[PDB]
Paper text:
Pol III is a multi-subunit complex composed of 17 subunits. A notable exception is the subunit RPC5, which in metazoans encompasses a long C-terminal extension (RPC5EXT, ~450 residues long), whose function is currently unknown. The RPC5EXT is formed by two consecutive tandem winged helix domains (tWHD1 residues 259–440; tWHD2 residues 556–708) connected by a 115 residue-long flexible linker.
Here we describe the 4.0 Å resolution cryo-EM structure of apo human Pol III. Hierarchical three-dimensional (3D) classification led to a reconstruction of the intact human Pol III from 25,369 particles at an overall resolution of 4.0 Å. The core of the enzyme is characterized by a very detailed EM map where side chains are clearly discernible. Interestingly, the coiled-coil region of the clamp subdomain within the largest subunit RPC1, which is in direct contact with the RPC3/6/7 heterotrimer, also displays a high degree of flexibility. As can be expected from the high degree of sequence conservation, the overall structure of human Pol III resembles the yeast counterpart. The deletion in the jaw domain removed a small unstructured loop, whereas two deletions in the human RPC1 foot domain result in a rearranged, more compact foot structure. In human RPC4, a small deletion removed a helix (residues 269–285), which in the yeast RPC4 protrudes back towards the Pol core and contacts RPC2. Deletion of this region may therefore highlight a weaker association between the human RPC4/5 heterodimer and core when compared to the yeast enzyme.
Residue numbers in the entry:
A (entry chain N): 12 to 186, 213 to 228, 239 to 292, 307 to 323, 359 to 580
B (entry chain N): 1334 to 1362
C (entry chain I): 1 to 125
D (entry chain J): 1 to 161, 184 to 201
E (entry chain N): 870 to 915, 919 to 985
F (entry chain M): 836 to 895
G (entry chain X): 4 to 163, 231 to 403, 426 to 532
H (entry chain M): 1075 to 1133
The structure:
């Protein structure tokens, strides 16, 4: 129907955040401390609250480990604390609200600026606060061209401190809790203008909410030796002593700042490269012990079942075979060291899905660095020849720099047959020989083919009907050429 | 400050894992 | 998941009953093994609905009685609800409609409802 | 008369029958996931009678299944204007007495919605009809399965419990042992 | 740096069927690929007037000879040419822009002959 | 497995989650020396000469 | 909280779209119809209807901005005045008769209406209230209209059978302040003090706004010229008690003479601070206890910072003394401006909770109004014709005893929550008067 | 993974009956790598605009 | 939907290769199987069998965001050449 079409980051939806609440602060200790054991406790680091161990009742998801999407829960602490980011904002923009009046930003005006703001794209409303960056609280209260000047308040850059005196300005400063202002008046004055998205009020650092435990792994040693986790925002549970309760707000926000604010790989392989020219230009070949690398869909089809069962009976230690085959009932069964299997009811036991080895393309991809062209990874065939090199028709070493120091090379494995057919017949025969970046062939006699063929062409060389021998590696030759 | 981010092009698509939609990936029967 | 219009029908009642019988006899046709494990409870609803329908006196007869109960009531300012009730019971007797059943006497002024009473006696059990 | 409902849901046509017969297969697909208990309000294991149109039958970007949607009509049993039927007493309970009509299964009936003197005798879990007519204490002892000509008002879908309530105590007739 | 930055900055370019490029909001970048509509994929020998002469050199339809000074016969073939790609048109603007220069090229071929 | 504080009493070594030291590659080694090299603390090493005579092949 | 309270009020009084647009204009300030429809996603006709409802109820005040299309903006306090419509109309019943009650009710809900419109509407409306006839005319209504206008309560709207009128909330707040101060002097002194304070306040209404910090001195010679009819206190008694209130730590009216003839001045700011402390004491007694009120009274002449004295007033060991000081600081009960504004925030949230609770008691049982109306219609049709007791017995089996008792319980809870709303609304009026008065 | 998540009373939870919010109208089942979900989580602490919506693949 | 005039008498190679891919999935789920059902009879080469289609009775519809639905039957136009 519809997958993602327009998505951005995620946050705390407070409702679904807090129905999954189990415990905020059970006691002074956690991790089943006082039990002198560790059955499963205490109700927040366990069950779930975010599925960070082998199994427990996953909340709104299930089951372990993945597909238990991060579970939420109210772990509120209610430690007095405020907006550190808006601490800095208030310090910088110097009381942008014009506290404690919060009068209308503009007056009449000139509605030209009004309609210009209302009929322009976003990322622009900062100009209103820029206009009132300085004039805020130093102006005529209830006047034209703005409504600020109330009430003589400018903020001081005393670090994270926001000291708001009834400034002249520059003539009313004090040093030790006098001439201060509380962020609660800022909160009330909320209660650049857009509360649809830009709400500083709800970001108050008093109803702090936690990301789920899917961020944090805990390496329980099965030995009770080290269970470190990172970071995380729940750690302030140990401050229950101060949880009972202007410079005090600065101290609280300083304590907060400690722990509040600041297509890779699939189905791969890498070995060394030393090729053959016996591999027809489209074909390539891999090692043999890449067939020991598996767990392929190759979903069974009706015309295929018998040809699949032929290799299904082989198992773990035969090249043309099968292993770990995905069963009909979503419970895949192995033919590896626990195999002792392959009775294989001939139409149903894997009637959905099978998984074989590299028999014939079955395309594979080859990696290079740096990938100068898009023709440094191309589509080409298989089957299969041993001696774990990266062998391929040596006329196409140019767009790979398949350098021959013996420095290794990377192989892919694509296990999805949707655009695999599309890939194999679009960038397999037209990608190689013709580039749009230059218009010049990449495939070419790299070396001695050049001089060997040259020497053939040299007006000297006269041959024998007995030298129909060398003819016959070419046009009386390997697969797909034996006409006369 | 509640300001949006401009990482919403198409190079994000590979980290975000969605089908491409331009020229031919915008099928509307 | 999603639906748009939740009321898009005004049809013949006993016709809907026989069509539910047809739905019952058609769902059981899906007894083949390929389509057996997937969906079967439609059989269950068809059978239970047919059982409750058999409880009703609405059986043994045709949807022509529906057009009777329409043409004899909508022509005398009766609402769709009253004839709807009278269809859902399919009155066994005539005086049923008058005293054993209600809201079916005055909109015809107890004069032409007698014709529907005679029809009910003629066809309905 | 039974209400047809326009419905729009995902249709997953398997590739097994991409070229085979369509219309009846489409109907089977529609009946696939419209089951009794919980799909939507109002919907419970029901079907169609006429077509309207068949919209975009996509496959996928490149994946297996299909992306067909629904334009059809769904034969629901909406709770109508108290349509007169026969209501068999489905069960018994101290809170209320269960009834069966034909729309849903569970039909709660409060005590006073029984005959006004007839109470629930929890000493025997029987809603004995204290049929206090003709001045007589005629206790019509009828357990689960009491004959009552029910007509119901409502239907429910969301709560932890398909529960109904058919309003009884007809002023024009009374005699809830029959009506 | 510059390779990854060029790749990171220049993905949205597409080639929708109106012969015109479009952008994240479908804003026109081009209308043709330089009149020709061509791109360097099929850059055959010199495009495509000298190598193809050799291509048809190598498959010899023997029956013909110089009797009528075929230059005029070459002009008649230019006429059947003028007819045979005025049925040109499709996704177009790629043949008329060069059809007359084609004609001029065969005309100079006839003059040389 | 015994908690250093006054924790569980029973873990007086029935609680072994054995930690094997096993790994190798896709060819036979040959254990050639075994070492109990123990500094002044009994922190037993096991030094081992896992020799693998990989004579050359296409690619070396 | 504040805007949440405004939304709850607007939903209670008028409807949904009106409340939406009022909240939106409170948040965003000045905005014309088009951007309002763009941001709120509401059709233009509904936006216009809701805005004209707001203007009719004098909620949204609009000024013609520069480029000739009308913008709109709402004031949070103006919508918080939707709290006081019950209180406005009730105090109208208090000060003047039911005719003035209907005048103010129409000007606050029926909104802008002319002299002819208001006068004739209420005149034809009040005829049915009295006995059959009595031929009550428009002339007396117009006379009461003019009289109440003279008292500044209801003023003719300026122009931006006419012409429209409205109620001046400024004089309503002035009357509230006068009544509150009279009651405060009554409940902190004897009734003589409150009556004398009333004597001072009698001629200080139209020359004084709703946020003035002090009133005019009143010479005792004219107070003897204007002796109270209910208090025939002589010159000696009046002067002695006024000068005693001058040399009174209460200071509800004070000397500023020397020379005479007695410049007795009521200190509005000091009395307002005393009333704020008394309301804080009441809330402390209710939730945090009466002994916390005792420590409040103790530390009235004490800290904040530093911490080196409060244990003396604690009288109990220093551990819990320091704990009580820490909870005094944490609760932000001293920055008087910030603490008082946060207390106003507490009362905003409290009335929001009370109105939401009343919404439950009036709406969660909404599947009862139709039943009650049908039963009442049955009773009306039964009492006149067919008064048999069988129908009464059937109704009693229909109105079961649990049903009637839960109806009484929900009505009782509605009344309790309404009274709580009204008490905390008086508290919010005091707090907002402080907020508009503490501004310096 | 076609996990279920949306903006209208929905988050990273079940598909058929979301114990987070089983509104039954907000089922999405969107293909997404777990990296974006980790971004959701780690940015829950560091507040930022959480835009979430869908669109039709069809006409 | 006769807005089919602005395509060369050829489908593009990208569209053709991807329709071959989706026909691969088709003939790889159970069967839409075609002119020769399994005359080409081979083991697990899923793709390389429906490449030999040369008829392809299916429709594909190509667009532009500021344009309508330029539709095309596979039959009615020329092939990869």
């Amino acid at each position: 129907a519809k997958k993602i079409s327009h998505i951005c980051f995620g946050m705390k939806s407070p409702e679904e955040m807090r129905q999954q609440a189990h415990i905020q602060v059970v006691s002074k200790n956690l991790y089943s401390q006082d039990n002198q054991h560790a059955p499963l406790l205490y109700g927040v680091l366990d069950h779930r609250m975010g599925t960070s161990e082998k199994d427990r009742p996953c909340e709104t998801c299930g089951k372990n480990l993945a597909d238990c999407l991060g579970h939420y829960g109210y772990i509120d602490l209610e430690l007095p604390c405020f907006h550190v980011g808006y601490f800095r904002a208030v310090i910088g923009i110097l009381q942008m609200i014009c506290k404690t009046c919060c009068h209308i930003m503009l007056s009449q005006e000139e509605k030209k600026q009004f309609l210009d703001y209302l009929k322009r794209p976003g990322l622009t409303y900062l100009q209103k606060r820029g206009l009132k960056k300085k004039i805020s609280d130093k102006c005529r209260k209830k006047n034209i061209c703005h409504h600020c000047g109330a009430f003589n308040g400018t903020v001081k850059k005393c670090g994270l401190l926001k000291i708001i005196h009834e400034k002249y300005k520059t003539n009313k400063k004090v040093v030790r809790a006098q001439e201060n202002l509380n962020p609660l008046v800022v909160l009330n004055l909320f209660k650049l203008m857009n509360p649809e998205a830009g709400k500083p009020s709800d970001l108050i650092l008093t109803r702090l909410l936690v990301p789920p435990l899917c961020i944090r792994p805990s390496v329980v040693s099965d030995l009770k030796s080290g269970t470190n986790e990172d970071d995380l925002t729940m750690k302030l549970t140990e401050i229950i002593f101060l949880n009972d309760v202007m410079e005090d707000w600065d101290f609280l926000q300083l304590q907060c700042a400690l722990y509040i604010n600041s297509k890779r790989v699939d189905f791969s392989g890498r070995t060394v490269i030393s090729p053959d020219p016996n591999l027809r230009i489209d074909e390539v070949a891999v090692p043999v012990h890449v067939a020991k690398i598996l767990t392929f869909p190759e979903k069974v089809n009706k015309a295929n079942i018998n040809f699949l069962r032929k290799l299904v009976q082989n198992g773990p230690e035969v090249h043309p075979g099968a292993n770990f085959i995905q069963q009909r009932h979503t419970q895949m069964k192995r033919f590896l060291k626990y195999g002792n299997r392959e009775k294989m009811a001939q139409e149903l036991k894997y009637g959905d899905i099978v998984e074989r080895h590299l028999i014939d393309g079955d395309v594979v991809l080859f990696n290079r660095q740096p990938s100068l062209h898009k023709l440094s990874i191309m589509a080409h065939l298989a089957r299969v020849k041993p001696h774990r090199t990266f062998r391929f028709n040596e006329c196409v070493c140019t767009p790979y720099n398949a350098d021959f120091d013996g420095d290794e090379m990377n192989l892919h494995l694509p296990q999805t047959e949707e655009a695999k057919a599309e890939a194999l017949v679009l960038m397999g025969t037209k990608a190689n020989l013709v580039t749009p970046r230059n218009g010049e062939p990449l495939i070419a006699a790299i070396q001695d083919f050049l001089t060997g063929a040259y020497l053939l062409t040299l007006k000297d060389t006269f041959f024998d009907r007995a030298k129909a021998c060398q003819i016959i590696a070419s046009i009386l030759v390997g697969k797909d050429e034996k006409i006369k | 400050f509640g300001q949006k981010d401009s990482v919403c092009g198409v190079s994000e698509c590979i980290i975000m894992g969605i089908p491409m939609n331009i020229g031919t990936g915008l099928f509307k029967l | 998941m999603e639906v748009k219009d939740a009321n898009s029908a005004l049809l013949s009642n006993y016709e809907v009953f026989q069509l539910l019988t047809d739905l019952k006899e058609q769902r059981k046709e899906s007894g083949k093994n390929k389509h057996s494990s997937g969906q079967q409870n439609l059989n269950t609803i068809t059978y239970e609905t047919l059982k409750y329908i058999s409880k009703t006196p609405c059986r043994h007869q045709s949807p022509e009685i529906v057009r009777e109960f329409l043409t004899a009531l909508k022509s005398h300012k009766l609402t769709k609800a009253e004839k709807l009730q009278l269809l859902n019971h399919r009155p066994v007797t005539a005086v049923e409609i008058q005293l054993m059943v209600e809201e079916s006497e005055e909109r015809l002024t107890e004069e032409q409802i007698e014709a529907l009473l005679h029809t009910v006696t003629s066809i309905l059990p | 008369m039974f209400v047809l409902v326009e419905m729009v849901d995902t249709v997953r046509i398997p590739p097994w029958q991409f070229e085979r017969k369509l219309n009846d297969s489409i109907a089977e697909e529609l009946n696939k996931k419209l089951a009794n208990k919980v799909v939507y309000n109002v919907g419970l294991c029901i079907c169609l009678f006429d077509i309207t149109k068949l919209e975009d039958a996509y496959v996928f970007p490149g994946d297996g299944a299909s992306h067909t949607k629904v334009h059809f009509r769904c034969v629901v049993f909406h709770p109508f204007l108290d349509e007169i039927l026969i209501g068999k007493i489905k069960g018994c309970s101290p809170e209320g007495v269960h009834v069966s009509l034909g729309f849903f299964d569970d039909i709660l009936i409060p005590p006073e919605s029984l005959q006004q003197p007839a109470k629930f005798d929890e000493a025997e879990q029987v809603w004995v009809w204290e049929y206090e007519t003709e001045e007589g204490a005629h206790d019509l002892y009828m357990d689960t399965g009491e004959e009552i000509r029910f007509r119901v008002v409502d239907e429910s879908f969301v709560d932890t419990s398909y529960t109904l309530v058919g309003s009884i105590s007809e002023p024009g007739l009374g005699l809830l042992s029959w009506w | 740096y510059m390779q990854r930055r060029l790749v990171k900055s220049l993905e949205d370019l597409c080639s929708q069927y109106d012969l015109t490029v479009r952008s994240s909001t479908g804003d026109i970048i081009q209308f043709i690929y330089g009149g020709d509509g061509l791109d360097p994929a099929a850059m055959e020998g010199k495009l495509e007037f000298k190598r193809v002469l050799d291509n048809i050199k190598a498959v010899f339809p023997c029956p013909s000879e110089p009797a009528l000074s075929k230059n005029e016969l070459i002009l008649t073939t230019e006429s059947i040419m003028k007819k045979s790609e005025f049925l040109c048109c499709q996704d177009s603007f790629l043949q008329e822009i060069k059809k007359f220069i084609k004609g001029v090229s065969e005309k100079i071929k006839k003059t040389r002959d | 497995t015994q908690i250093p504080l006054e924790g569980s009493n029973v873990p007086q070594q029935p609680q072994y989650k054995d930690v094997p030291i096993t790994y190798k590659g896709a060819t036979d080694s040959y254990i050639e020396k075994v070492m109990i090299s123990s500094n002044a603390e009994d922190a037993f090493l096991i030094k081992m000469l896992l020799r693998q005579t990989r004579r050359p092949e296409i690619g070396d | 909280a504040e805007i949440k309270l405004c939304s709850l009020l607007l939903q209670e009084h008028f409807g949904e779209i009106v409340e939406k647009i009022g909240v939106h204009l409170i948040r965003t300030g000045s905005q014309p119809l088009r951007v309002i429809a763009h941001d709120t996603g509401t059709s233009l006709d509904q936006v216009k209807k809701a805005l004209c409802v707001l203007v009719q109820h004098n909620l949204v005040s609009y000024q013609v901005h520069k480029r000739g299309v009308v913008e709109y903006e709402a004031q949070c306090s103006r919508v918080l005045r939707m709290l006081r419509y019950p209180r406005y109309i009730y105090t109208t019943k208090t000060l003047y008769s039911d005719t003035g009650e209907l005048i103010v009710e129409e000007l606050l809900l029926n909104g802008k209406l002319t002299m002819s419109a208001v006068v004739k509407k209420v005149a034809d409306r009040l005829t049915e209230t009295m006995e059959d006839g009595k031929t009550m005319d428009y002339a007396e209504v117009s006379n009461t209209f003019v009289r109440l206008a003279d008292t500044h309560f209801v003023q003719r709207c300026p122009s931006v059978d006419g012409i429209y009128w409205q109620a001046n909330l400024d004089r309503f707040h002035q009357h509230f302040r006068d009544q509150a101060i009279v009651s405060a002097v009554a409940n902190r002194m004897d009734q003589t003090s409150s009556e004398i304070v009333r004597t001072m306040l009698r001629m200080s209404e139209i020359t004084t706004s709703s946020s003035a910090p002090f009133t005019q001195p009143l010479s005792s010679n004219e107070i003897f010229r204007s002796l109270p009819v209910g208090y025939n206190i002589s010159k000696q008694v009046l002067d002695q008690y006024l000068t005693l209130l001058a040399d009174d730590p209460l200071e509800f009216v004070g000397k500023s003479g020397d020379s005479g003839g007695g410049m007795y001045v009521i200190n509005l700011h000091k009395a307002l601070a005393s009333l704020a402390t008394a309301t804080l004491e009441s809330v402390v007694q209710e939730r945090f206890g009466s002994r916390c009120a005792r420590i409040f009274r103790l530390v009235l002449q004490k800290k904040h910072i530093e911490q080196k004295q409060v244990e003396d007033f604690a009288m109990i060991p220093a551990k819990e003394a320091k704990d009580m000081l820490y909870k005094m600081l944490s609760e932000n009960f001293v920055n008087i401006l910030s603490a008082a504004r946060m207390l106003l925030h507490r009362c905003y949230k409290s009335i929001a909770n009370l109105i939401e609770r009343r919404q439950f008691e009036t709406k969660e049982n909404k599947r009862l109004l139709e039943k009650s109306q049908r039963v009442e219609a049955i009773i009306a049709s039964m009492q006149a014709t067919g008064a048999e007791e069988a129908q009464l017995q059937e109704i009693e089996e229909m109105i079961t005893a649990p049903e009637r008792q839960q109806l009484e319980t929900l009505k009782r809870n509605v009344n309790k929550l309404d009274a709580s709303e009204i008490q905390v609304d008086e508290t919010i009026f005091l707090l907002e008067s402080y907020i508009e008065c503490t501004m310096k | 993974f076609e996990v279920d998540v949306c903006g209208q009373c929905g988050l990273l939870g079940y598909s058929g009956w979301c114990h987070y919010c089983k509104s039954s109208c907000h089922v999405s089942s969107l293909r997404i790598p777990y990296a974006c979900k980790l971004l959701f989580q780690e940015l829950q602490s560091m507040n930022i605009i959480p835009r979430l919506k869908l669109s039709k693949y069809n006409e | 939907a006769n807005q089919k005039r602005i395509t060369t008498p050829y489908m593009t190679k990208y569209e053709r290769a991807r329709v071959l891919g989706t026909r691969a999935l088709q003939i790889a789920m159970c069967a839409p199987v075609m002119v020769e059902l399994e005359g080409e009879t081979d083991p697990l080469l899923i793709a390389m069998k429906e490449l030999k289609a040369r008829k392809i009775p299916i429709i594909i519809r190509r667009y532009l965001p500021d344009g309508s639905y330029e539709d095309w039957g596979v039959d009615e136009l020329i092939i990869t050449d």
